[PDB]
Design a protein around this ligand. Sequence first.
Ligand SMILES: Nc1ncnc2c1ncn2[C@H]1C[C@H](O)[C@@H](COP(=O)(O)NP(=O)(O)OP(=O)(O)O)O1
Ligand SMILES: [Mg+2]
Ligand SMILES: [Mg+2]
Length: 341
Amino acid sequence: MIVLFVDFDYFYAQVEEVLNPSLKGKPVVVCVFSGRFEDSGAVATANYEARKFGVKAGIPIVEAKKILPNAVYLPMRKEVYQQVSSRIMNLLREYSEKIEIASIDEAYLDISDKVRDYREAYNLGLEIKNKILEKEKITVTVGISKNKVFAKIAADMAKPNGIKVIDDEEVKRLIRELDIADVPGIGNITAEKLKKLGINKLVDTLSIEFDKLKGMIGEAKAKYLISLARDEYNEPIRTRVRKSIGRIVTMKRNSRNLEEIKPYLFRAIEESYYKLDKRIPKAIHVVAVTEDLDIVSRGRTFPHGISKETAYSESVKLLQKILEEDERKIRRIGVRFSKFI
DNA sequence: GGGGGAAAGATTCG
DNA sequence: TCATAGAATCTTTCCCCC
Ligand SMILES: Nc1ncnc2c1ncn2[C@H]1C[C@H](O)[C@@H](COP(=O)(O)NP(=O)(O)OP(=O)(O)O)O1
Ligand SMILES: [Mg+2]
Ligand SMILES: [Mg+2]
């Protein structure tokens, strides 16, 4: 194939800079405030100035402030970012309609029916960066290679404001040379199970017995790694359809009182139903984060769609089934709907 | 022995 | 008073027949 991957640079932070140009040059932090105390919550993203000091996505806002006290801290306005990303995705459906929209800021493009070779895709890539830089002022990074995986890897190396091709010879080079931890889908838990087997490159997966690999990282992740090591990984760019819709909130204090948790859970239901929008779920799950940050959940499928009033009652049952079967207090409560009609 | 579905959890952050 | 959020994909155990 010819796959073209685009991922927007420090996206939420950069949108705030587009909307408020006097931020360019200072470190910007976009935050998901939780409401337990002043500055509780986590960082959604920071721009590249703030990353130099270790302020990146996922870390506590308090930790970010101990490092960069006088950085600008903005609250996460996701609805604004979704609107700008939709407009950039509509720009991308003009360069192929085989398009995989994989996050709020990523898309894979099957440009096999649209250019010839890699120098023909590298130039379409600059066409897309320029068209995006002018229509919406956002810089992006482009990866191009023979499949979706090495496309993403390509952009990960080219970041920020970059565009990199990985051709077939470097794909072979990287199957030998790239640390396997840098393959998409390989987190820290997978990455150390692989080192405890002496696997550090993709090619080492061809040298180990399969069932030993399958027993340690699972059948699916083993076949995924081996097919990448054989240069056999070929997977279609396909249109993804949302299979879950939910909402989860943080309670102002840890609790296990049914009457006290209920408002939090009902607002999560009301919000999910708005987002559901004509879609009808047959399946519902209640999700709780305990005071020690474990994640517990109880669900139930139905033979028919779930009305909002049902959802309301079913969740209180599922939520009690949690306070029953578990001992710890609850920190965050949420609901998730699936199995649409 | 499967198929197929469900439930609850684990991993990744695609 | 560290530790958001939403979604996908997968593993394991269970179940219900046949
Ligand atoms: N842990 C998180 N929590 C909340 N939102 C997050 C998040 N991680 C990412 N986002 C939201 C906000 C992120 O901006 C947006 C895009 O995520 P990426 O493309 O993974 N990171 P970005 O574009 O910021 O930087 P780069 O230039 O390194 O891609 O998704
Ligand atoms: Mg990005
Ligand atoms: Mg992204």
